[model samples]
Structures are given as structure tokens and as C-alpha cells.
Target: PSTGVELYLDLLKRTVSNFIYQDATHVAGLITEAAFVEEARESGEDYPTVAHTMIGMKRLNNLQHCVESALRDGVPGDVLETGVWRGGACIFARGILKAYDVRDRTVWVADSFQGFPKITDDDHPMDAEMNLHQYNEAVDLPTSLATVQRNFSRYGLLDDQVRFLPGWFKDTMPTAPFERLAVLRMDGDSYGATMDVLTHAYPRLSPGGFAIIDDYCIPACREAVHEYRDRHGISDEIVEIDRQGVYWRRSA
Candidate 1:
């Protein structure tokens, strides 16, 4: 039967993703094209202007699955999302914990709150080609720390369990205080950002926990995921989510 926590989260997922309106940008009215909206939202092709997150439903579902799995398996750790845009995923992570009455775990939300670092690197040519930095102030891509906190509070998810580390991945991740992580959701959208977390955060992920790359659709992020796994000899099976996102359960 359709019930309880999943039922509640289904509503939350739709609300956070703004599935009800199917509108990507506030400037444009509802798309009305059922097929495109359905597909785009699921695949994360369109960035929601009002939605708390743009990662889409399946990606969020993947997070739910990972967090639930961690809780079910008695994994000892907290949740983390390295690149929180509007803090949607992290807020949802907090929701999952609250739903399950999990009090010990914290949702460590990390972000620059200043958008991507424009500092280009020789090793990351794909990031340069993509040039997401150009959209630095072009779109509402970069959200402020206050906005994210307010978003969390709007959903009544903000608490001591939800901690915010406001800084770029390079600065915040290395000095991160968390000792263990049960869910690592990466949505940095760049090679440098991806590697920063993989280098620092991946090691702290619990053996049975999950490693999720939310921007796997971006070539730079994908490359970092592949290179990290290959270099570290990580053998966990990588599974696809909505084609744009990927996740693997850590075995080592």
C-alpha cells in the first residue's frame, strides 16, 4: 500500500522539485509540454528557478534510497552533500533522517555560497570548455548561505542536525570536522570541485555507505569520478540514476 514515510517523502520530493508546476524558470510560465517536463525534470535537463533543487526526482530518490539503506544497515555516520545549490538535497537529507527518527546523524552541507571558483586549471580543460563560470552571475545559479538556510527553515528541516560549512570545496572539505559519512552526494559540476571532495570526503565514507555524483551528466565531473575510482582501485559497482546521476555503495 502507498503509505507512511515514503508517502510523506513522495510529497516532499514533488514539492522540492516543483513537479506540480513543471516550471523551470520563473520568467517562463509552465511548459505545459507533459513529455518534456516529465523527462527534463527526471533527467535534470532544466534548472528549476523556484525549486529548491535542480537534481530532479530520480536523483533525490537515489539519495532517499542511500540514506534509508544506511539507516537500515546500521551504518555509523552522518550525511553530506558537497555542493549544495539551494540546499534542496541537504534539506531532503535532513527530512529523511527526521522521518526515520535518526537523531545522531547530521547533514553536513558544504558550498561556496559564492558559486564556482573561476580559477581555471590546466588539468581541467573540460571545465574551461563548459565555462560554467561565465554563468557566474548570468543566472541565479549561485545561491547565498542565508537563502539556503531560509529554504531549510521554510520546510522546517533546519536544526542542530543540519550544519552548514560555507566555503569552496578546497577550503571547507580539507578542514571538515566530520569523522565519518554515510551518504556523500557530490554535485559540484566541475572536475576540480569533484576531485576536492573525492580526495578529502570519500575516505571518510562508511564501507557500506553510498557515494553519489549528482552532476554525472557533466563530462568534467564524470571524468573526476572515473579517475578517482581507477586511481584508488575502488571496485564498487557504479549504478546510473536517471542517466545524469550515478552512485555506488562503498565496499572498502
Candidate 2:
């Protein structure tokens, strides 16, 4: 279901209340650390949560607020996220959309149902030859996907508003008919996967729309995006929210 502006605001207010009152303290710490890890980190090894948890959660929160604010302001578009692991953030997003009674817009969830793809030479790994980056092997794709869908169902969010496209960005993005996207959340880890989504989805963002790059704080991610932006002459204003999140708006 698509949500309208006023309802979105009311829902956001309530969500904040839930976050404060109902959310677990440990999860809250995780979220808090995800938002401000840079200040808390002492060294590379010291960084908590391999992907900078505090920064990620902060970015997630910011993206939530951005989409909510935009929708409340009567922005006409849908919301999309490229990488959802357990569906926590996506579920939160759907709840917001549902609270607003937005039945016309859809929440697009894109992911490779097969889990992480084969590691290429271009991807960074502590020991590529040793294959220690075998996190892909550790992942059970079918089970993971089932868990995500189950989480959605548990949250009462498995409605038509949430659309799941199960495949790599290269295979599925070309066919995604997303126009004027209000929010695009990218959590793909590798440089190749991240770039593929950006190449396909960047042009589809609506004016004043937002794009949150979940890897902005990572060196490889930043390098890849910078290189791609340079190649494409994408001079849109890029703003960093905390470290891991990068936000940009379409030209008005």
C-alpha cells in the first residue's frame, strides 16, 4: 500500500516512539554504533561489525527519514532497495508506507536470491588466493531468502506493496520499470555489485529524490562510485550522512 504525506509523518512519529520504547537495548546500541562508528573506532580491526555497523544503521535511519519526509511532502514515486539481508530495514520501510495508506506505490526489494555471487579478481579479499572471502559459501541462499520473506510475513508486511525481484542487478535491473524513484538504498557489498546497481538505477532517480549508498565509507566502494561518477559526468551534489551513507538528489 502507498502512503500519503500526513499519515507518513504520524507513522514516523510513532516509529520513533517504538524505537525508543519497544526496540531492544542491544539492537539500539547496534543501531547507534552503526551510525557513529567512525568516532568510536580506534583502528581497522577495532571497527565493529565488518561493514561499520553504526554507520550502516545511521544511513538506514537517514534513508528512512528521507523517504518518509519526501512522501509526506507529496513526492510522487516508489521506494527501492537493492540489498536486503534479513529484511529489518525493508520491513520498517513497508510499515511506514502502510501507515500512510499508500496503496498506489510499491516498495521494490532487489536481491540475488542465490546470495553473494562468485568472487572476482576485482573484488577485495584479505586473501583471494586462499579463498578466505568464502562468505558466499557460508551463505545458504534459499534459507536466507525464506528467512527474509518470513520476517516480512511476521511483521504483517508481505502485501502487494512489497515486490521482490530475485536476481543479480545485471540480470534484473534492466527490466525494472522504476520511474522517479524517491529512495534507492544500495547495500550491495562488492564494488562490482554496487556499481552495477548504480549504473542501472542512477538515471531513474526522480528530481529531489534520494539515493543512499550503503558503502560510501568503504574505500573500495567510494573509489568505485567516484570513478563511475567521473566517467558518467554525474555532477549531482553528493552529501555524506555519517560515513557509510551517501545521499544525492536529482537536479530540479
Candidate 3:
């Protein structure tokens, strides 16, 4: 009884879920059962709380909207995404630039490639408790720069328009080449990494640019964002994209 679009979306959601679970018999089998389907329909949110990919479909759509809207409004600057896991989001960012026939803009993909750095005394104390670096799927999964480049190439999105900055946020962000940012998307999960990106990148964001936090649901990440905004006296409205994601646009 479902419409074609609804059916297609359902298939896509299942596909993503399967990809995340990787054909695990128990989890994947249970997910397709009638009970799960009925529960999802009755529940408020259907998507998983943790996104295994760099960005899920809804967030991807939001990124497209923000980028296209920025271009339409003549906002000058390039797109940037930190903490690219498999380079999905940044590849889509490049796709937007290509779709709009915008040659001047570039998409910056920044990440450690080696995965999250070990927590230190210098980092926010909360990060030690989160133990983000120890997450097997997140940090130990190990997506290399070459692997990300292959992903971009697979999508035909790899080109000079895309640039890679590989290192810890503290090491690479401060001196990364691009000047202005129309969309600064941060997926870094730790308080220190989150604050590091904000400290360096926010200063160069265009007046109408967007600053997206992909881990707003995490306490440490949320605290870092609030503290940084407070210290900078930035009063722009912070808009929630999902339970786990939020964004704010810079005001002149």
C-alpha cells in the first residue's frame, strides 16, 4: 500500500542499516521482523541514534540545502567537513559544487585518517570518560586517506575541487589552506577536538555561513559548543537538525 517514494525510502533505510550491521545474522534478522516494523511506525524516530556513516540521508539532505542555499544567496566561501569517516559527506559537498556548476568553490575533507587521538590531561576531562578513541567501530575501524579517495572516485566526485587535510584537528586545522568557509561541518566527537575546530574555523566563516555540529547529542560535544559560543559572545540561533545534530548560521 505504500507509495513508490515511501517504498524506495524504506528500502534505502534498510540498505543503510544492513551496511552498518554488515549482514550480522541476529541484528539484521531481527530488524526486518514485523515487530520491529510496527514499533518503528509507532515510535517517534525511526533512524538509529548513532550514524555509522559520516552522515545519514537526512543530514545529507540538510547539507545539500545549506550549500545550495549559500550559493543562491551569493555567500562566498568553500565547504569544509571535519571527521570524515568514509568521506560520504564531503563527497556530497563536492557533488553540490559540481551540480551548481560552481568552479570557484572547493570541498575540504579533514580527518586524522588514523582515527581519534588518545585522550590527554590537556583535553576536557569529560573526553576521558567518553573513551571515544577506544570505540572499535569508530576508531579501530581504520579508514585510510587512500580508502576515502577511492570512495570519492567510486562516486565520480574526486577531482581538484576536493582537498584533503589529514591529521588531528589541533595539528592540521590552524594552518589548513582555505580561507573562508560557507559550511563548516564538524563531526569530531570529543570536547577538545570540537573546541579545536571552532577556535580555528569559526573565525573565518562567512557572515551567512553555517556551522554544523554532528555530535550535539553527546554531552561533551554540547558543552564544548555552548562554552565556545558563550566565550565568543556568538548569539546566533542554534537550530537542531536531529536529536544528534545541530547547526547555527553566522550573522553579520
Candidate 4:
């Protein structure tokens, strides 16, 4: 493992330890499924390889662990993500749900499906259409959704549990039917995209639920979160999960 992966593993260990110690004892048994490992091997897909299976797999494994911990904490609501690139992490989330036999909670995926939008002056260049992170650049909007759905279908994951809301969050988020959120993973890279999703969904989160931002370590994203949380009276105890990510659990 690289130095960064080592650091993340160390942090994940500490987070899981703290979570288990502070929460109900039943939380100790939340484990990811073996099916995901088998599916990855069978399909020959995952991050890191999709990006370098090693690099992206390690990050996603940690993410799956975090979401599983939240579910074990008695959060019974939908899991959501603002930005889903090819839906790998969301697939992992589904694998966890399937493994645990969790059928009630839906996984809401919100994306433009059109690839990154053109960034205006008020937006971050990294989130623009020409951005290096535009891994789905060749995929048009409809095809992107089709590809994601196909990937899910191949894994036997396409069911009522996973919802694909294809549109810009600017248009779809405010009107989304999500009543209570259990876990909201925000992968929006820019300050604007991050704030937009939070503005629409934070108030809808259940107490003790989570808002996992994928860009917390980036200076711009950190500042945006700080400003937004302060404005919304959120506590300073926001938990940093990774260099570019943090999770805020709604206080009960």
C-alpha cells in the first residue's frame, strides 16, 4: 500500500473503533459482503482499475465501512449521493445492503448524467467539463445513465432499492422526494456544487444521520462547508473522514 492508503487505513480503524465504542453494542458486527469481492473479480471492475483498482478500491472500501456503520446505528432511511461517477461506490453500498439483507432503505443517486457541466466564472475549474476528473467524458447524458444501470444490472443490483435521478442537482435536488436521509454522500467537487446539494438536503437529514462530503480537505470545499455549517448552526465537531472528505452526523 502507498503512504496515503496506509494513512487512510489507520484512520478508518480509529473511526470504526470510536463509532463502535460510542454506539450500541450491536454495531460491532457490521461487515461488508463477500459478494462484492466476488462480483469485482467476476466482472473485472472497481476503482483504481477503473481508476487503478488498488487506489480507488481502498477508498471505496473505507466508504462502504462508514456507510455500514451508519446503518448499524439504527438509521432507517434512504442513502443518497450528489455526484456518482460510473456508480462504483453506490454499487458497493448496494452490495452492503444486500449482504445485510437490508431491503427497506433506497439508494438515491442524483447526477447530471450529462457529464460535468461547463463551469462559469463563479464555479471551480476542476468541476468543469474539461476537468481531468471527467472520466465519463465520452459518455453522453443518456448513455451515462444507461451504462450505470447496465453495470448494476450485471451485478443483479438493479431493483427498486436503487433510484437514478438523472438531472443537474440545481434542478432536481430541491424537488427530490427524499423525506429523511440516512446517509448523504456528497461527491460534488466544487464549492458551488457542494453547497447546492447541502442547501437542499441538510435540513432533511434525520437526527444522527450523516452528510459525507467528498471534498472536505480541499481548501475551497472546507471553507464552503465551514461557512454553510456555521450559517445553519451545525456544531464544530464535524468529523473528518479523509483528507478530502468529512462526515457530519446529525445531533439527536
lDDT (Cα, tens digit) per residue for candidate 2, span 1-252: 554755554454333223322322122312442332333331111122222122234554676687777787776688888877555557767877777677887888888866667767755552233242355443322225676787678767888888887788888887797776788888775666678888888677777777788767666667668888899777888887764567776666
What are the models' TM-scores?
0.92, 0.72, 0.81, 0.71
In candidate 3, stretches whose alpha carbon ends up further than 4 angstroms from where it belongs are: 1-54, 138-140
Clashing pairs in 1: none
- Pick the winner on lDDT between candidates 1 and 2: 1
TM-score of 4: 0.71
The CA-based lDDT of model 1 is what? 0.85
Give Cα-based local distance difference scores for all models. 0.85, 0.63, 0.75, 0.63
Which candidate comes out best when scored by TM-score?
1
> What TM-score would you give candidate 3 relative to the actual structure?
0.81
lDDT of 4 by residue, 159-189 (tens): 9999988888778889899898888888766
lDDT of 3 at 188: 90
After superposing candidate 1, which stretches have Cα over 4 Å from the reference?
Answer: 26-36, 121-123
Better of 1 and 4 by lDDT: 1
On residues 138-200, what C-alpha lDDT tens digit does candidate 3 reach at each position? 223457999889878876778999999999899899999999999999989789889999999
lDDT of 1 by residue, 1-252 (tens): 986987888988988888977765533223433343677777666657678888888888899999999999988799999888898888889998888888899999999998877755654788887777766564477899999999999999989999998988888898799999999999888998899999999999999999998888788898999999999999898899886788999996
Top candidate, metric lDDT: 1
For model 3 the local lDDT of residue 88 reads: 65
